[PDB]
């Protein structure tokens, strides 16, 4: 009757009809199918684009393929039928190409564009979703830390490398809320021979396996996807809902609310390497009652 992940984040059909309406969520991702019925009118496509050229001289830039990742994530955050925060407005920036590849420099220019946009026309609290990862980057971590210090909430994917999230960015930036992925059995997600990252740089886990969301194959199509990007999108939606109910929350207070309302000790720590079990938070995100 309801996608497993929306039931999982509901404290024990998906009820909130217009959650997160005071918040604007910026998405730095691939292109999006902005006329998909699930997200039409809810996502405003900015003029921002900074992407590297695709690999392979004979690449075919089909819109359904190019838009797959970003369209699904925009749906997870604010989608009409399958979204977490159905009242949140979104603004999309294109920093990933058709193959899902971007650059640290393009991501930096995008984070700057968000701050410039805010200064020109301030609205309510902002949440920035970064469903991407690269190697540890001093400059990307610094840019995230500065935007967080300026009052903006950042949420990122822990990474899908079954490795310590501290070796990746923006996952390793302490000021960013870093999200790992769990499945319907509340266990860490396996993705081929890899899976969710773990360790002290992860703040919490959220549903990230077989997540129903908008499919760019057609204007009413839905598809299931898995990964720490989907888990981060759940936390961006939960944060938009918490900030819309309590708009005066600081970043520290919001982080405290996310931990307090999470389900505790449901993950079997045996999945993580031995030394990472005490360092990895045993928390799965949920909405407040």
């Amino acid at each position: 009757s309801i996608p497993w992940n929306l039931e999982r984040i509901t404290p024990p059909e998906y009820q909130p009809p217009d959650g997160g309406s005071l918040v604007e969520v910026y998405l730095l991702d691939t292109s999006i199918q902005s006329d998909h019925r699930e997200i039409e009118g809810r996502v405003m496509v900015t003029d921002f684009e900074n992407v590297p050229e695709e690999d392979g001289t004979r690449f075919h830039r089909q819109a359904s393929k190019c838009d797959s990742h970003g369209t699904h994530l925009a749906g997870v955050v604010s989608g009409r039928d399958a979204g977490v925060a159905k009242g949140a407005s979104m603004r999309s920036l294109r920093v990933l190409n058709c193959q899902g590849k971007g650059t640290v420099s393009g991501t930096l220019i995008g984070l700057e564009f968000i701050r410039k946009s805010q200064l020109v026309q301030p609205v309510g609290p902002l949440v920035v979703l970064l469903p991407l990862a690269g190697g540890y980057s001093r400059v990307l971590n610094a840019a995230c830390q500065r935007l967080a210090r300026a009052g903006v909430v950042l949420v990122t994917a822990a990474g899908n490398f079954r490795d310590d999230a501290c070796l990746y960015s923006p996952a390793s930036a302490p000021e960013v809320i870093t999200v790992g992925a769990t499945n319907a059995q509340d266990q860490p997600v396996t993705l081929g021979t890899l899976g969710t990252n773990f360790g002290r740089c992860v703040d919490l886990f959220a549903p990230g396996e077989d997540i129903i969301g908008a499919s760019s194959d057609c204007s009413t199509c839905f598809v299931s996807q898995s990964g720490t990007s989907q888990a981060a999108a759940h936390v961006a939606g939960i944060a938009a809902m918490m900030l819309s109910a309590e708009p005066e929350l600081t970043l520290a207070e919001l982080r405290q609310r996310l931990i307090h309302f999470s389900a505790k000790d449901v993950i079997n720590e045996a999945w993580f390497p031995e030394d990472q079990r005490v360092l990895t938070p045993n928390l799965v995100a949920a909405l407040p009652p």
Partner: protein
């Protein structure tokens, strides 16, 4: 004390493009002048450079397309905090 950094995951590096990060309170006018000074010093050594972007708002600095041979010279520019070689990010 200006330092150089490049991605530890060697296949994810993007050599030839560098983010020159200036000290925290550097003003935009100073960032633009530092980028122009880099181009002039590089040209005296026979190297072309291209300033792709000048940063202001979060981090002061600029993005430059140039040979990494110019990195020792670039680290001596006024206001430089550090220089990072560009690298890849991936959808998760």
């Amino acid at each position: 004390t200006a330092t150089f950094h490049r991605c530890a995951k060697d296949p994810w590096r993007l050599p030839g493009t560098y983010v020159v990060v200036l000290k925290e309170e550097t003003h935009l006018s100073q960032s633009e002048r530092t980028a122009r000074r880099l181009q002039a010093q590089a040209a005296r050594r026979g190297y072309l450079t291209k300033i792709l972007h000048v940063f202001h708002g979060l981090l002061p600095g600029f993005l430059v397309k140039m040979s990494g041979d110019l990195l020792e010279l670039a680290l001596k520019l006024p206001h430089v905090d550090y220089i990072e070689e560009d690298s890849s990010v991936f959808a998760q």
